[PDB]
Enzyme design. Structure first.
Site, PDB file in Angstrom:
ATOM      1  N   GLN A   1       0.855   3.851  -3.217  1.00  0.00           N
ATOM      2  CA  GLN A   1       0.281   5.187  -3.099  1.00  0.00           C
ATOM      3  C   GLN A   1       1.346   6.264  -3.268  1.00  0.00           C
ATOM      4  OE1 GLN A   1      -3.792   4.975  -0.985  1.00  0.00           O
ATOM      5  NE2 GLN A   1      -2.251   5.033   0.653  1.00  0.00           N
TER       6      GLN A   1
ATOM      7  N   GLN B   1       0.821  -1.208   0.000  1.00  0.00           N
ATOM      8  CA  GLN B   1       0.000   0.000   0.000  1.00  0.00           C
ATOM      9  C   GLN B   1       0.857   1.261   0.000  1.00  0.00           C
ATOM     10  OE1 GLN B   1      -3.631   0.499   2.379  1.00  0.00           O
ATOM     11  NE2 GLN B   1      -2.669   2.282   3.335  1.00  0.00           N
TER      12      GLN B   1
ATOM     13  N   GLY C   1       4.547  -2.960   6.727  1.00  0.00           N
ATOM     14  CA  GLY C   1       3.546  -3.825   6.127  1.00  0.00           C
ATOM     15  C   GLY C   1       4.081  -5.219   5.859  1.00  0.00           C
TER      16      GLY C   1
ATOM     17  N   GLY D   1       5.049  -4.887   2.104  1.00  0.00           N
ATOM     18  CA  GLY D   1       6.162  -3.967   1.960  1.00  0.00           C
ATOM     19  C   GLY D   1       7.458  -4.500   2.536  1.00  0.00           C
TER      20      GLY D   1
ATOM     21  N   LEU E   1      22.434   5.579 -11.408  1.00  0.00           N
ATOM     22  CA  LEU E   1      22.233   5.023 -10.070  1.00  0.00           C
ATOM     23  C   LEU E   1      23.553   4.735  -9.370  1.00  0.00           C
ATOM     24  CD1 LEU E   1      19.290   2.545 -10.749  1.00  0.00           C
ATOM     25  CD2 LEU E   1      19.214   4.902  -9.898  1.00  0.00           C
TER      26      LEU E   1
ATOM     27  N   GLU F   1      26.188   6.442  -9.347  1.00  0.00           N
ATOM     28  CA  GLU F   1      26.754   7.644  -8.748  1.00  0.00           C
ATOM     29  C   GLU F   1      26.198   7.891  -7.352  1.00  0.00           C
ATOM     30  OE1 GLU F   1      26.950  10.693 -11.767  1.00  0.00           O
ATOM     31  OE2 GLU F   1      27.606  12.197 -10.302  1.00  0.00           O
TER      32      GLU F   1
ATOM     33  N   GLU G   1       5.078  -3.908  13.619  1.00  0.00           N
ATOM     34  CA  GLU G   1       5.990  -3.316  12.648  1.00  0.00           C
ATOM     35  C   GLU G   1       7.465  -3.334  13.046  1.00  0.00           C
ATOM     36  OE1 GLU G   1       3.255   0.230  12.312  1.00  0.00           O
ATOM     37  OE2 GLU G   1       4.011   0.068  10.251  1.00  0.00           O
TER      38      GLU G   1
ATOM     39  N   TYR H   1      -2.748  10.243   4.615  1.00  0.00           N
ATOM     40  CA  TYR H   1      -1.770   9.648   3.712  1.00  0.00           C
ATOM     41  C   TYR H   1      -1.610  10.477   2.448  1.00  0.00           C
ATOM     42  CZ  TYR H   1      -1.320   5.351   6.439  1.00  0.00           C
ATOM     43  OH  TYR H   1      -1.055   4.428   7.425  1.00  0.00           O
TER      44      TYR H   1
HETATM   45  N1  GTP Z   1       3.711   7.622   4.119  1.00  0.00           N
HETATM   46  C1  GTP Z   1       2.828   6.656   3.896  1.00  0.00           C
HETATM   47  N2  GTP Z   1       2.820   5.552   4.713  1.00  0.00           N
HETATM   48  C2  GTP Z   1       1.929   4.562   4.497  1.00  0.00           C
HETATM   49  C3  GTP Z   1       1.013   4.634   3.459  1.00  0.00           C
HETATM   50  N3  GTP Z   1       0.265   3.508   3.495  1.00  0.00           N
HETATM   51  C4  GTP Z   1       0.683   2.735   4.524  1.00  0.00           C
HETATM   52  N4  GTP Z   1       1.710   3.387   5.157  1.00  0.00           N
HETATM   53  C5  GTP Z   1       2.494   2.921   6.308  1.00  0.00           C
HETATM   54  O1  GTP Z   1       2.885   1.585   6.048  1.00  0.00           O
HETATM   55  C6  GTP Z   1       2.756   0.797   7.219  1.00  0.00           C
HETATM   56  C7  GTP Z   1       1.742  -0.305   6.960  1.00  0.00           C
HETATM   57  O2  GTP Z   1       2.186  -1.037   5.850  1.00  0.00           O
HETATM   58  P1  GTP Z   1       1.364  -1.121   4.472  1.00  0.00           P
HETATM   59  O3  GTP Z   1       2.153  -0.540   3.326  1.00  0.00           O
HETATM   60  O4  GTP Z   1       0.017  -0.464   4.606  1.00  0.00           O
HETATM   61  O5  GTP Z   1       1.155  -2.713   4.349  1.00  0.00           O
HETATM   62  P2  GTP Z   1       1.419  -3.530   2.997  1.00  0.00           P
HETATM   63  O6  GTP Z   1       2.777  -3.217   2.400  1.00  0.00           O
HETATM   64  O7  GTP Z   1       0.307  -3.244   2.021  1.00  0.00           O
HETATM   65  O8  GTP Z   1       1.436  -5.081   3.444  1.00  0.00           O
HETATM   66  P3  GTP Z   1       0.146  -5.880   3.995  1.00  0.00           P
HETATM   67  O9  GTP Z   1       0.378  -6.239   5.441  1.00  0.00           O
HETATM   68  O10 GTP Z   1       0.021  -7.143   3.175  1.00  0.00           O
HETATM   69  O11 GTP Z   1      -1.098  -5.031   3.850  1.00  0.00           O
HETATM   70  C8  GTP Z   1       2.273   1.713   8.321  1.00  0.00           C
HETATM   71  O12 GTP Z   1       3.417   2.153   9.019  1.00  0.00           O
HETATM   72  C9  GTP Z   1       1.654   2.866   7.571  1.00  0.00           C
HETATM   73  O13 GTP Z   1       1.733   4.052   8.323  1.00  0.00           O
HETATM   74  C10 GTP Z   1       1.017   5.746   2.622  1.00  0.00           C
HETATM   75  O14 GTP Z   1       0.212   5.839   1.691  1.00  0.00           O
HETATM   76  N5  GTP Z   1       1.930   6.754   2.851  1.00  0.00           N
HETATM   77 MG    MG Z   2      -1.662  -3.906   2.242  1.00  0.00          MG
END
Ligand code: GTP
Ligand code: MG
Ligand code: ACP
Ligand code: GDP
Ligand code: DLK
Ligand code: CA
Ligand code: CA
Ligand code: CA
Ligand code: CA
Ligand code: MG
Ligand code: MG
Lengths: 439, 425, 53, 349
Positions: A15, A11, A143, A146, A252, A254, A183, A224
């Site tokens: 985004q 996510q 995440g 992520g 990259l 550099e 996290e 967000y």
């Molecule tokens: N800056 C920013 N942080 C985000 C955003 N979306 C989620 N986060 C941060 O990311 C963390 C949560 O991870 P996510 O990216 O939502 O989870 P994911 O990568 O989709 O992995 P899943 O667990 O499968 O949903 C939290 O610390 C959130 O504050 C965003 O759009 N912008």
């Molecule tokens: Mg997610």
């Protein structure tokens, strides 16, 4: 011309990527339908912006990007958003159900079933490249996708593209804008696995972006959307050298050469100024000296820490707008006589400076006012280890009780990976201390 | 995507479940005939979590109604929203369970369980991506307690990687139907310890005391008790059913709320509870939400420590004021949160308030104080079992004393496990 | 305070100012992913055995 | 209500500060590892400054300035004075000092030592280290070889300093002393000098012909209470306070403590703390700091004040704990966390 492929994972990655490509289109004059009137070579070319955009025979400029998420709700916003015509369906990859904030679920359980598909969609982009530089990877630490799926992807990218550079943009977890508690586990686990595979990683702490939005944009409760538009400005200033004519950070490699003398210590601190509210009716424009001085204020850093109590290994100044070298050197000279700027003994005390005459582009209807000049400072300071110490302490608190560990073991992960990852972070913390602190 | 399959078993389970569907159908603009008549597309954005779309713009609850006697489900089919349920999803026997866990779990319930699983399978197969199951039941009777936990075990066998959450009504001697309720509850709790991911513990004495002391109901009925439960269930599920901050399925939610697999028994609460047109400030909402008088497990949170806490605010209010008040409550109660789970108090806001309130707050606490509830049941269990009283109702269904001894030991271990994390530093 | 490597173009310019001088293989990845999948399978087989009892 | 944590149990100053905070009825003490505090009474060594100011919605204050050790270690104080242009190598109120390892300044120290014996000047030096605690690693000698042989005999970094051979001697007694000043720096970097100081006096007659009898030369409270037979004869505990010392200067030398000594002390305190302000100020940081300092001074027979060292975790005089600790709560703690004729002198800048 050498192409760069952007990869947005989870996510936060998707985004932020959506926010960045919107800004890239505005900076390069690319309309949401992919057309670019200023581009007089139809269906081809090797201009600087072609590092990030390919071209169809119909004149569409297509981002060299892949979006991957384990559930579809965030990428569906890209599929139906303002810039939906920009992307081909094969660039947007969605699974059925997500990794549930569980690194082990993203890395092992779900990652094993989708990694080959992601690599095939990436390979298709690489086949359009005549001289691929490498990859820019956007993701959160916290995440499950992520953290878990990114580390698996970074491992396979080193296998399939061993020569290519890989840069990260990583969102460091902040309790203010997170409803998760595991996290710290996911952050340490993904940093341990990704460390050898990343050449340079720019960490952004949501806590810092949140407070900048509160303090400088007068947003009482940043969303967000607020955070990502500010982050995309910083990202754009870091990648502008890859997309425009210039002589600093033009590929990259550099980035590692200029910012990372020691491979494990590859987390430069970013500082950005000025951040001005668009609602501010009356605003006096800041000088080169004032925005440069602001680069040494912790309140403008992407990660809150105190560089006065660390040492610098490298410093890059990236200006956009009405800036000439004479005013930069006059500002730096004054700042040396007033700030605690200490380099390590085995590095020159100096600044690599890059100036792009085009002032920052702001999204119409955003929170940021247009300014006549802005700067992003990239400094490799040992003070960023404060962010590792915070994370490792939270890890230690929960892991001493094995809190939440059963969720990870239940996905096929072994408990020893926790302590192996934590011991690697302990060694990383020790490396920063050996570099930055006297006896 | 993110569909939930709802099951309600036995008398208490079906009466509370029916109220739950009355409440959220009104929130989503669905009339008793399943037709949508709302005024906001926000009511339909996540309608698929709990409802199926039949042609004709009809919305049908993804709900399965189970009992071992026809009486209560006849009442449901006659009730306010009785016509909204899929007729095929009424699965009932004729014998009853006689308030006997053994009949629900081993004899009468075993004869009916396969046909319930057929309906469960049919609803699951039509889900784009099944998110999990929820069950409403009591632990003190025979069908909801015995057959309910039999169903949960069969569901985990067929769907081993699906979340299973329950709303479980705990018996109390002060709001009791039979003396064997502690036997039924103790046998059931061990099943829940193994086979659920979250169990919301709703104590009938807490519901009664709230109705009597706070709502000024001189003579509470089960109906009055069930009004509190359906309102609590609505608040607990608000963030799944409406757009807002939370982008989480049941698994992600359980991951962040359950640090140890067996310690997944939650203490829910709701605010306001008033006996009424006055606006509640955010400080008032937050203060009442953390007050033990507004919680429904009849456990004093000051007698234990919070492992994790979630709070859901509903209505149009200042998120900045919400953050400030949550910090004020944490500082007032700093001693009652474990310090080895950082940032273990999380909040979410939904702009859509429930019926008849401009704002409200729902409390979800994973507190070690819940051990007091299991201690109460364990004491009542042992007081009879020490004399083997009323056991013949169970040995007559094929059970032997050893299974009771093991259930007693299992809940005493659960209590011990809570006590060790309440003393951990 | 020396300026070096001054490069100028129409888009901007860059320079440097000095103040003072001074991997796992594909098979091994597949091995780890399959090892975790087998630990999931063993745990699930224990649950199904437990439920069979 | 406010919350605070205690992480240095050996602090007499902040044991009394913690006592006062609890007695206000508006401060609650948490466990030492609870991160949800407003105030940290931190540990002396390796205070985790990097974990402060990251708890959402909590204003956090700590009783130590990160980086103030550069002033409060003997080796680093010498380096700070020599290399800071605002203090400079020509600083007039700090004795000639050199850092000696068992970088190093061994040859430069020998250079000035050689020149000092050329003109037959007083060539007495004192060797000390901050690692040597409470009168242990001190050696006074007029011959450089005995100093250096004693230095490399130890494995710790030392400083050799010019020994003030002409100290102001109190009468009767013909006896040495040193002046301790307590200085509080709040989160706004206001510099508050406590109006009450103390003289730690030697109760033995000063004897410049024997530097081995380190009882008339070292004015430490532990050294006088153990080795001096005349301990407590002239004043209780070998502690003379400002009212008596001021009266002595008026009777004996026709001057005041304010004119002859305190103007220099204020100048020195202000010069040291303003010098390191850019390095340690928390004005724009995500957490705030205050700190109590113990400045130690010497006075020569010409009524010139010399800075000896700065202590970052000082103790207080027995009869001054109540007043000073109340002042810490007033200007340093309640200034950030308010409750529901100042004893300090504000040194302006
Ligand atoms: N800056 C920013 N942080 C985000 C955003 N979306 C989620 N986060 C941060 O990311 C963390 C949560 O991870 P996510 O990216 O939502 O989870 P994911 O990568 O989709 O992995 P899943 O667990 O499968 O949903 C939290 O610390 C959130 O504050 C965003 O759009 N912008
Ligand atoms: Mg997610
Ligand atoms: N250059 C010098 N000339 C004369 N006397 C000196 C001197 N340096 C130190 N002394 C004497 O040595 C004594 C202790 O010195 P120093 O302050 O280095 O030790 P210390 O740090 O253990 C005491 P404290 O911790 O209370 O400040 C002082 O009281 C002073 O009288
Ligand atoms: N809150 C509430 N509790 C109930 C209701 N009906 C029964 N109970 C409680 O549930 C237990 C009896 O179980 P019940 O559901 O009637 O038996 P079953 O039909 O065999 O599942 C006792 O503890 C009762 O106090 C109800 O409508 N509301
Ligand atoms: C960490 O999760 C939160 C953080 C802040 C605020 C609220 C939350 N939600 C939480 C904590 C949950 C759950 O556990 C499960 C709930 C549920 C229970 C039974 C049936 C359906 C849904 C939905 C739900 O909403
Ligand atoms: Ca072109
Ligand atoms: Ca590589
Ligand atoms: Ca039969
Ligand atoms: Ca069958
Ligand atoms: Mg009944
Ligand atoms: Mg000392």
């Amino acid at each position: 011309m050498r192409e760069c492929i952007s990869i947005h994972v989870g996510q936060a990655g998707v985004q932020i990527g959506n926010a960045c490509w919107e800004l890239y289109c505005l900076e390069h004059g690319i309309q949401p339908d992919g057309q670019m009137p200023s581009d007089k070579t139809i269906g081809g070319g090797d201009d600087s912006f072609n590092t990030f955009f390919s071209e169809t025979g119909a004149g569409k400029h297509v981002p060299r990007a892949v979006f991957v998420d384990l559930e579809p709700t965030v990428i569906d916003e890209v599929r139906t958003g303002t810039y939906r015509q920009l992307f081909h369906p094969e660039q947007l990859i969605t699974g059925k159900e997500d990794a549930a904030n569980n690194y082990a679920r993203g890395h092992y359980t779900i990652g094993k079933e989708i990694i080959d598909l992601v690599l095939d969609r990436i390979r298709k982009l690489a086949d359009q490249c005549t001289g691929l530089q490498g990859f820019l990877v956007f993701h959160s630490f916290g995440g499950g996708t992520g953290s878990g799926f990114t580390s698996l992807l970074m491992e396979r990218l080193s296998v399939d593209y061993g020569k290519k550079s890989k840069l990260e943009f990583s969102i460091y977890p902040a309790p203010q804008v997170s409803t998760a508690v595991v996290e710290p586990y996911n952050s340490i686990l993904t940093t341990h696995t990704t460390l050898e595979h990343s050449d340079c990683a720019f960490m952004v702490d949501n806590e810092a972006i949140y407070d900048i939005c509160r303090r400088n944009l007068d947003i009482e409760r940043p969303t967000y959307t607020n955070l990502n538009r500010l982050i995309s400005q910083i990202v754009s200033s870091i990648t502008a050298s890859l997309r425009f004519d210039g002589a600093l950070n033009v590929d990259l490699t550099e980035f590692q050469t200029n910012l990372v003398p020691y491979p494990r210590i590859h987390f430069p601190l970013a500082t950005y100024a000025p951040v001005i509210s668009a609602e501010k009716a009356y605003h006096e424009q800041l000088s080169v000296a004032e925005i440069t001085n602001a680069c040494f204020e912790p309140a403008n850093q992407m990660v809150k820490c105190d560089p006065r109590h660390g040492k610098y290994m490298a410093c890059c100044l990236l200006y956009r707008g009405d800036v000439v070298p004479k005013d930069v050197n006059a500002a730096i000279a004054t700042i040396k006589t007033k700030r605690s700027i200490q380099f390590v003994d085995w590095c020159p005390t100096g600044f690599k400076v890059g100036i792009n005459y085009q002032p920052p582009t702001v999204v119409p209807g955003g929170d940021l006012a247009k300014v006549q000049r802005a700067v992003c400072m990239l400094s490799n300071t040992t003070a960023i280890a404060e962010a590792w110490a915070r994370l490792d302490h939270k890890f230690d608190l929960m892991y001493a009780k094995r809190a939440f560990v059963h969720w990870y073991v239940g996905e096929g992960m072994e408990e020893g990976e926790f302590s192996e990852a934590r011991e690697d972070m302990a060694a990383l913390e020790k490396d920063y201390e050996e570099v930055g602190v006297d006896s | 995507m993110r569909e939930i399959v709802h099951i309600q078993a036995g008398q208490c389970g079906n009466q509370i479940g029916a109220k739950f569907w009355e409440v959220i159908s009104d929130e989503h603009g669905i009339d008793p005939t399943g037709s949508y008549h709302g005024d906001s597309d926000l009511q339909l954005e996540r309608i698929n979590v709990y409802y199926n779309e039949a042609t004709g713009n009809k919305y049908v609850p993804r709900a399965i109604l189970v009992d071992l006697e026809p009486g209560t489900m006849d009442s449901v089919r006659s009730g306010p929203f009785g016509q909204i349920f899929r007729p095929d999803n009424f699965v009932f026997g004729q014998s009853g369970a006689g308030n006997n866990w053994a009949k629900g779990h081993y004899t009468e319930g075993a004869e009916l369980v396969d046909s319930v699983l057929d309906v469960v399978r049919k609803e699951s197969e039509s889900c784009d991506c099944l998110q999990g199951f929820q069950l409403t039941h009591s632990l003190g009777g025979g069908t909801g307690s015995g057959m309910g936990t039999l169903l949960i075990s069969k569901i985990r066998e067929e769907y081993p990687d699906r979340i299973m959450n329950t709303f479980s009504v705990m018996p109390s001697p002060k709001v009791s139907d039979t003396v064997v309720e502690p036997y039924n509850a103790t046998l059931s709790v061990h099943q829940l310890v193994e086979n659920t991911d979250e169990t919301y513990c709703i104590d009938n004495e807490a519901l009664y005391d709230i109705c009597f002391r706070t709502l000024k109901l001189t003579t509470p009925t089960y109906g009055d008790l069930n009004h509190l439960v359906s309102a609590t269930m609505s608040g607990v599920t608000t963030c799944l059913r409406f757009p807002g901050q939370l982008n989480a399925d049941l698994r992600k939610l359980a991951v962040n709320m359950v640090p140890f697999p067996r310690l997944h028994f939650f203490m829910p609460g709701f605010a306001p509870l008033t006996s009424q047109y006055r606006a509640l400030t955010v400080p008032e909402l937050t203060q009442q939400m953390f007050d033990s008088k507004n919680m429904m497990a009849a456990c004093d949170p000051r007698h234990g420590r919070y492992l994790t806490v979630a709070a859901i605010f509903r209505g149009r209010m200042s998120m900045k004021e919400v953050d400030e008040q949550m910090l004020n409550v944490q500082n007032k109660n700093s001693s009652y949160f474990v310090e080895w789970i950082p940032n273990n108090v999380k909040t979410a806001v939904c702009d859509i308030p429930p019926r008849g309130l401009k704002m409200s707050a729902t409390f979800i606490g994973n507190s070690t104080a819940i051990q007091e509830l299991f201690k109460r049941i364990s004491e009542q269990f042992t007081a009879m079992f020490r004399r083997k009283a009323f056991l013949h109702w169970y040995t007559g269904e094929g059970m032997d004393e050893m299974e009771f001894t093991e259930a007693e030991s299992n809940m005493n271990d659960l209590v011990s496990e809570y006590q060790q994390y309440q003393d951990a530093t | 305070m020396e300026v070096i490597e001054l490069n100028k173009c129409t888009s901007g310019q860059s320079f440097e100012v000095i103040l003072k001088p001074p991997d796992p293989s594909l098979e091994e990845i597949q091995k780890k992913l399959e090892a975790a999948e087998e630990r999931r399978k063993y745990q699930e087989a224990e649950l199904l055995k437990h439920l069979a009892e | 209500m406010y919350t605070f944590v205690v992480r240095d149990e050996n602090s007499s100053v902040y044991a009394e500060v913690s006592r006062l905070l609890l007695a206000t009825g508006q401060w609650k003490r948490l466990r030492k590892d609870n991160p949800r505090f407003n105030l940290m009474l931190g540990e002396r060594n390796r205070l985790p400054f990097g974990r402060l100011g990251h708890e959402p919605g909590l204003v956090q204050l700590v009783n130590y300035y990160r980086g103030a050790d550069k002033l409060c270690r003997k080796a680093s104080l010498v380096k700070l004075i020599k290399t800071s242009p605002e203090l400079s190598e020509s600083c007039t109120w700090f004795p000639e000092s050199y850092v000696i390892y068992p970088t190093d300044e061994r040859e430069v120290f020998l250079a000035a030592y050689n020149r000092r014996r050329e003109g037959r000047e007083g060539n007495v030096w004192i060797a000390k280290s901050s690692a040597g605690a409470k009168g242990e690693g001190i050696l006074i000698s007029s011959e450089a070889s005995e100093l250096l042989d004693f230095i490399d005999e130890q494995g710790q970094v030392h400083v050799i300093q010019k020994y003030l051979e002409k100290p102001l001697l109190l009468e009767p007694g013909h006896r040495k002393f040193d002046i301790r000043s307590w200085v509080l720096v709040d989160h706004l970097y206001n510099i508050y000098l406590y109006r009450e100081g103390v003289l730690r006096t030697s109760s033995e007659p000063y004897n410049s012909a024997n530097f081995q009898d380190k009882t008339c030369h070292l004015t430490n409270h532990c050294i006088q209470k153990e080795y001096s037979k005349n301990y407590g004869r002239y004043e209780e505990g070998n502690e003379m306070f400002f009212e008596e010392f001021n009266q002595y200067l008026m009777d004996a030398l026709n001057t005041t403590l304010e004119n002859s000594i305190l103007l220099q002390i204020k100048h020195i305190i202000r010069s040291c703390l303003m010098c390191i302000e850019p390095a340690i100020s928390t004005k724009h940081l995500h957490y705030q700091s205050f700190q109590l300092f113990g400045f130690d001074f010497m006075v020569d027979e010409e009524l010139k004040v010399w800075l000896i060292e700065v202590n970052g975790a000082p103790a207080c005089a027995q009869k001054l704990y109540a007043e000073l600790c109340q002042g810490i709560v007033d200007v340093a703690i309640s200034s950030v966390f308010p409750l529901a004729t100042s004893i300090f002198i504000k040194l302006h800048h």
